[PDB]
Symmetry: C3
Subunit: 29 residues, 3 copies
Amino acid sequence: EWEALEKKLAALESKLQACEKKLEALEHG
Amino acid sequence: EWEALEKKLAALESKLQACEKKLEALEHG
Amino acid sequence: EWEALEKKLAALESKLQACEKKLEALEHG
Ligand SMILES: [Zn+2]
Ligand SMILES: [Zn+2]
Ligand SMILES: [Zn+2]
Ligand SMILES: [Zn+2]
Ligand SMILES: [Zn+2]
Ligand SMILES: [Zn+2]
């Protein structure tokens, strides 16, 4: 459970970065 | 602290999910 | 490590709040 939490937190971080990038490129183009 | 943090991770995950759904909507108008 | 996990969760939540505020500005002008 400790390590499953840690991996969820890593995926959240990666997902959020992917959002941040979509968010940016919708802002542009 | 454990289930508090788990609850806090669950809330972020669904807020992020909302964000990704609203970004995709914005994408299509 | 617990305190490191919590700081990472705090930072994720700040970036999410920031992505949410940017998304509202894009939705609504
Ligand atoms: Zn659990
Ligand atoms: Zn639990
Ligand atoms: Zn799409
Ligand atoms: Zn789509
Ligand atoms: Zn909105
Ligand atoms: Zn509007």
